[PDB]
Design a protein around this nucleic acid. Structure first.
Ligand SMILES: [Zn+2]
Length: 271
DNA sequence: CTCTTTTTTCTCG
DNA sequence: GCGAGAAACAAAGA
């Protein structure tokens, strides 16, 4: 998932599990708990979920007075709320059981991670990760963004994916944002003029807030949290190879940029 | 059968 | 420090 999908999950969890006491925690894949599964089980069993937050693509469960469970879903992680008698599915790894149901984490590729840290360690954790600002008008300052782009000779798509200029874009929304901003993904950032940077900055905020409003991009639904999104119906370029650009009618092309599949319009995003 | 495809963080040179 | 490539892992498609 990217930031809009994780935000969608965050909102659903906030609505459904806040206030629930964790009765037990079980793992069939305990090695994805990077701070130690048995330690987590001992610390969190019997505690109550107080809140769910998000920073960039990270989910943050607020548990008990002092605990923060930092969850990254990476490429394929999925949460679902299930009955206590629900059958095991193949790639289920962890479950938090409550009195009336359970929260199951599944991840086919086993890339996702859990880390248990304390409340006063959350801000240092994300400083160490060097996560950039949230993609909001209030936090994403165009002036610093502009100065960083001016200084660099990185290509814009890989630099955006780093999470350091702004948090939250992954391959789908970086491709969408660069099409909306009319910028080619291989453009060296120190070649961007001020008006392009301004359109890029606003397009990042607008696309991600649109995607959040639509419940993220689900391809497809899965019975999991966040699986009823509608943003996939709004994609202009990602996965649209060979289809016609809605802006000019050129075929959308796919290339590889720094190892990643990259979808763009060659007319609207001049090299 | 092989090769390719689909977030973060490493090695290598 | 950089970029290129790939590991972590599983599955599906050519
Ligand atoms: Zn076009």
């Amino acid at each position: 998932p990217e930031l809009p999908e994780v935000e969608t999950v965050r909102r659903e969890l906030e609505k459904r599990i806040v206030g629930q006491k964790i009765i037990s925690i079980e793992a069939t894949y305990p090695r994805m708990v990077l701070t130690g599964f048995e330690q987590l089980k001992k610390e969190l069993t019997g505690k109550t979920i107080q809140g769910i937050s998000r920073r960039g693509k990270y989910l943050i469960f607020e548990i008990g007075d002092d605990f923060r469970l930092i969850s990254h879903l990476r490429m394929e992680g999925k949460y679902r709320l299930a009955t206590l008698d629900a059958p095991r599915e193949k790639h289920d790894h962890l479950t938090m059981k409550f009195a009336d149901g359970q929260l199951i984490y599944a991840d086919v590729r086993k890339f996702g991670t859990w880390e248990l840290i304390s409340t006063d360690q959350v801000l240092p954790y994300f400083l160490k990760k060097k996560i950039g600002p949230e993609p909001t008008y209030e936090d994403f300052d165009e002036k610093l963004f502009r100065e960083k782009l001016r200084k660099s000779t990185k290509k814009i798509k890989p630099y955006l994916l780093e999470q350091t200029l702004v948090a939250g874009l992954g391959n789908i929304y970086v491709d969408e944002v660069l099409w909306l901003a009319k910028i080619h993904p291989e453009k060296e950032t120190n070649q961007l003029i001020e008006s392009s940077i301004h359109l890029l900055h606003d397009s990042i905020i607008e696309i991600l807030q649109k995607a959040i409003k639509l419940g993220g991009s689900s391809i497809r639904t899965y019975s999991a949290l966040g699986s009823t999104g509608k943003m996939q119906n709004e994609l202009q370029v990602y996965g649209k190879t060979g289809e016609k650009c809605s802006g000019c009618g050129a075929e959308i092309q796919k290339i590889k940029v720094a190892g990643r599949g990259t979808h763009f319009c060659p007319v609207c995003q001049q090299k």
